[PDB]
Design a protein around this ligand. Structure first.
Ligand SMILES: O=S([O-])[O-]
Ligand SMILES: O=S([O-])[O-]
Ligand SMILES: O=S([O-])[O-]
Ligand SMILES: O=S([O-])[O-]
Lengths: 220, 220, 221, 220
């Protein structure tokens, strides 16, 4: 009491537009906030089949699901029950640019996610519009405070078919709903994200993430 | 050929969300497509007073309004009567990122503009959230083709209080609705945009743009 | 004060640099008309020739004194003389190539002297620079403004490539007068066009030309 | 008969120019390649006292010093005895940009390093020219292949006095001298780097780095 339980449910609704293509996607899942693990079943409700790589959406589908050790302030679990919100930009190396936001709330044992995602300027023959991506490689998010706001920057990479990589820089700004939530010091958060399964058109996808916060070398 | 008249009316509808603040803005104006001039009266219908600098929105409020000389293919006038659409990213120097789009159609003597605008990651004490902007400086858009699509990049700058400047890079991708509209060669488009007047909170704004296409030195 | 800049000036230039780990030295001798914003220069690779990279990436490094300034815009560059000024520049190419360059500019009599350095890193082996697939810079427009108390010019640039694709490069130059008391200009634009008029097969010898004109943008330009 | 020995020496010379200020700096160190730990004593031979934050130079003062696990190809240890070279760009958030190069060779138990470092466009009032930096935060370098070349991208941050942070993006390209050195798959390398001690003007500096390669979650 102690808002967050060892096992939580996850309800998510994303709406968005990439390349002028509108879509709506519902998510239903479960996770273990204290182990930093979560899974979700996603369903394209409108806009299917998506004309673009589903992978660009997957980080938009909650840093509550991250294992924080005792020596690092856990801004995210501290933000409940009132919750918090985040904004993000994704800057892909070929000019594709996405913005996204999620307003995260909690009712009982369930997190609710209102997610918006917009992508512009993706080249027609790029790996995104040609759906040539395989997965995100595991990443490390750098967490720091800027102008009063917890900020996470990430150098990300999509593995492509033919074993090339496709670079994307992510900046996320995280804001507790409640006044006064103490900001953490600089720290790192390892991520790995995986589409465990999906149908042909990616109208149905099962997503998994694992995340662990740490202080970097040599204290990790 | 185009059915674009020397004098046209402009109907505009924008919806958007900056920093989590949703808004709706209507525009009604008139322009001279062949003189590359237009003006518009904008009214904030929802979300007023805006908590952010109105200037960030104004380039989203149609390159049909640009004087094109004979020796340069005019992709925009050649796109009608069927019309065209664009997507844009605005990358501000302090991490603020916006995306925008506009679907442009024509019915008789009126252009219709369905515009969307999203902005994320603006710092609380930056010139945008603190409304320290004065105007966009006159600019020059660099037009070229990339992956089969007409693309415009601009080095933009907002004049700020005290005559400092706040930099923003714009990339716009332009796509004619009808197939096989001939793409132009590399060229430049000069722009100047100005808020001619506005009320205290910028719920009401009169906007003007002048744009002229040219080939650069030594010609221009 | 009187600039001591004549309508017809000589240009002496010395570049040294390193791109992709390849060292080079290039000399330049040219002439120009500061008030007309036009200049031409004959360049000769003295060391490291033949260059294994596109000569074009070097050409903007080969002096905003050579820009026609109208009377209503403060001319920081001509006012920097006789003492002179220096600039530093970053070039950020869309495929990861990054160059930095500097020029220290002085004047003796009818001649500008230029000590130029140029370093480029992270150009991919099969990109248009290492493969020498560039044709020219397209005409550009430099945005001039005071940033952190220093006149700065930002530019969206584009190299035409063979196959008529374009290759994007963003430029930022910082310009600093050597002498105190040089008035800073308000925001303005400088149109450029730069052209290799001729070259020998390996670009060991190159004739370069530039035309530049400052203006206030629309609606009065 | 291995080229890499458990305890090795490091001889280094850097020459460079930041904001027009020329400098020469010699380094003499020792390290343990297999444990990814090294220390070096640096001495400014020319250009002291440096007018800029010594911290911008420290990553330029060899990925052979990284603990590589068996399941990740170790490109750097495989590059000896002949050696390898790297080029780097450092893009700071306020427009300061640096490039650096190191040509690394080996004789007996000693690595030799020919290092060059050039920085431009640092603002006079910024934390580099004001010497307001305290340290690099621990980081994670993302290693991947692009156009045949091992490439490392890093989201870096300098902690500043007052506990603000100053962001810098690093790209390094690494090239074995010898033909036929096998490229590794995608992986991460954790770093931490620390000035253990220095005299008042940073004419003398003792530097330490620890680095460890890993596969990220869930392995790590
Ligand atoms: O937790 S990872 O295997 O997507
Ligand atoms: O089109 S300009 O005169 O604001
Ligand atoms: O005057 S320009 O075509 O070098
Ligand atoms: O080199 S590490 O101990 O910050």
């Amino acid at each position: 009491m102690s808002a967050i339980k060892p096992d939580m449910k996850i309800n998510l609704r994303m709406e968005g537009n990439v390349n002028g293509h509108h879509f709506v996607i519902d998510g239903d899942g479960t996770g273990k906030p204290f182990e930093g693990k979560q899974s979700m079943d996603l369903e394209v409700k409108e806009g299917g089949p998506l004309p673009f790589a589903f992978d660009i959406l997957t980080t938009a589908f909650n840093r509550v699901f991250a294992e924080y050790p005792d020596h690092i302030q856990d801004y995210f679990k501290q933000s409940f029950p009132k919750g918090y919100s985040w904004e993000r930009s994704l800057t892909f190396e070929d000019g594709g640019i996405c913005i996204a936001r999620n307003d995260i709330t909690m009712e009982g044992d369930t997190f609710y996610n209102k997610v918006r995602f917009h992508g512009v300027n993706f080249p027609a023959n790029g790996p995104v519009m040609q759906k040539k991506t395989l997965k995100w490689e595991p990443s490390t998010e750098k967490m720091y405070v800027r102008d009063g706001v917890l900020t996470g920057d990430i150098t990300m990479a999509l593995l492509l078919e033919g074993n090339a990589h496709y670079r994307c820089d992510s900046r996320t700004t995280y804001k507790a709903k409640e006044k006064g939530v103490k900001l953490p010091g600089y720290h790192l958060v390892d991520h790995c994200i995986e589409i465990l399964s999906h149908d042909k058109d990616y109208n149905k996808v099962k997503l998994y993430e694992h995340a662990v916060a740490h202080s970097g070398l040599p204290d990790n």
